[PDB]
């Protein structure tokens, strides 16, 4: 199995690098040669979930048999027996084995600095560039750094 | 099983290897070349777990089968039984063997000292560089020290 | 099994080689050549723990079926039965026999002695070259000693 | 079996073998050839505990089934039956055979005699080069004596 | 098994013989060449202990069933049935055959006397250069002779 | 069988020379040659002692099963019924066969007599270079007598 671990870490550093070069292909015609440096890094979890829910419908029953005795005399005897049947929904998911649960993006840009609207422009094409997903917990930090 | 943990080792040692290129590609072109020192140690833990969850819904139940007799005479005498369906869902996850539990990365910065601005740049660049995750218990620490 | 033990030892003492080789690429353009001493002492548990979790979830129960008689007359009779289901986690976990369980670094630095901002930055570094744990109960010390 | 206790013995003698390697490698660059003298006992336990813990959960039951009788009339009559579930750990530990259960180091330094300063130093810096551990029964003796 | 009991005196003849090697080797510096003369008794026992514990613990009980009944009328009658559950520890042990359960160490020092101080400092040479252990009954005796 | 007795007496021969040669060993330089004879007497005791022992831990029962019914009216009858579970040790030890029982060591010097404390003093010494053990019943005598 340890060789199946050596393969997903090719994997994962396969990924990074394919975002490289796409971050490359975006900036090189917008900045120049040597002008940025960028890495990224991709995690990516490796667990077998598989998943199976039997879900109902509460609100929606539909009577299959029905009893119903109600009698009189005062005495005051209402008894009664149902049967019911129910909206049944059975969905086995099996989810796939390496999924990218987090992925950080760090751009430095060589100084002569850069204005804080076309940082902003830099970061919106890199935002659909990589993929951006907040909510993934993703992280993307553009900054402005003096090259040696 | 001992050649296992040796490769177990190997594996700790190639990721630790990895990110230190990464830090190399990033920090060689905005410091130089013999400008700086970094060393990264990274923790792998290598268990076996395998979970199976069963839960419930208890707050939408959907009756199946339902009786109810209740007489009056004075005497008030109120039967009930009643049988439910509950939403099921049935998971069983296993985790991936090897993943990296703790992340701590250290970078010296020879002076001729850096600004304080400046380090917390290099620092904003290497989040993102590694993929720093504090709630992870990652550590990294920058810093300006005299290369001799 | 003895041979077994061998190899243990084997892994340690590679592992404190290993540690010691990080110290060295660290500390050898800081200080220099032969201005520093050092030696790591790492122990290594082979314990061979295998545990299983069966947890439930008290306060979300979900009625099944249910049985309810309350009658009058004065005379008050409340009868019940009830069947629940529970939330059910079974987990079993299997920990990898060889972990660091305590890791020792002394680090000494030749005189001409330092000042304890570059000892404190030194011990910076360090924290991160090696992985230093305290919760783990690691020990690492810095000390300024005179080299005959 | 004599035999597996003789390889014992050749395993705490090549224990004491390396710790006294890591003596020299630190104090032979800080005091010289010659001023120090250091010897090592290492004690091992070669037992063969196995142990299995079953280790529940009193505080946090969870009711499986119930039922509740509660009559009244003068007379008061409740009567109750229940059935818990709770959780349920179950740990089979294995310890490995050779353990240190005891380290005694003990160094002289030659005089011309050492200051109490550097006495505390050389102790340190000891201290992380054997890996002391007090709690374990250690001892760690470091004197100044008169070589002849 | 005489054939074991003569390699059981071999393997105390063969310990005798390490320890007196390692006084040797702290004391021929310290002292000189036949200034000194030391003599070790080691008493071994090679019996064949074999233990096994079950260990419970009474003061956190987990009810797994439970029955209650309580009327009155006066009359007051309290039924309970109750079924518990224990945190069980069952622990096998087995102990090494062979194991040093008293050792006696003696060293002689030429006068030409010694003061009680070096007397002394020797001593604490000596303790951690054999191991002396006072909970196991070991003694170690230095005394300052007259060679002729 | 008179074979293995034969072997027995050879076994207790042996270990008298030993102690011998370590008495010469330490006296021969303290004294000189010829100016101390010594002997030695080992008891060996062969028997095939087997134990096994079950023990118990009264003050610390679990509760395992409790039933206890308490009616009053007067009548006042309290009914109890209760089950335990204890701490149970088994051990097995199996004693080596030939352990020394008693050791007599006696030894002359020469006159020309010899002074209490060098008396006491060689005393010590061979306290220690033979491993005297009082609590065995073992013996040493130290006498200066008129050698011929």
Redesign the interface.
Same mark, same amino acid.
């Given at each position: =199995?340890?060789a199946a671990?050596?393969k997903?870490?090719e994997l994962e550093?396969s990924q990074e690098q394919a975002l490289r070069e796409k971050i490359d292909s975006v900036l090189l015609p917008i900045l120049g040669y040597?002008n940025y440096?960028a890495?990224? #890094?991709?995690?990516m #979890? *490796?667990? =077998?979930?598989?998943?199976?829910?039997?879900? *109902? #419908?509460?609100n929606t029953?539909a009577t299959r048999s029905e009893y119903a005795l109600e009698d009189y005399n005062?005495?005051?005897?209402?008894?009664?027996?149902?049967? *019911?049947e129910?909206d049944t929904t059975i969905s086995h998911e099996r989810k796939q084995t390496g999924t990218v649960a987090?992925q950080?993006?760090?751009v430095?840009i060589k100084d002569r600095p850069m204005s804080e609207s076309e940082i902003n422009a830099i970061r919106q094409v890199l935002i659909g560039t990589v993929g951006f997903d907040q909510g993934r917990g993703d992280?993307?930090?553009v900054?402005s750094?003096? *090259? =040696?």
């Open positions: =199995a340890s671990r050596r997903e870490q550093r040597g440096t890495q990224v #890094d991709i995690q #979890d *490796f667990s =077998a979930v598989e998943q199976t829910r039997k879900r *109902f #419908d509460p029953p005062g005495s005051v005897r209402k008894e009664s027996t149902r049967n *019911f129910l987090r950080t993006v760090s430095a992280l993307l930090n900054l750094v003096k *090259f =040696a």
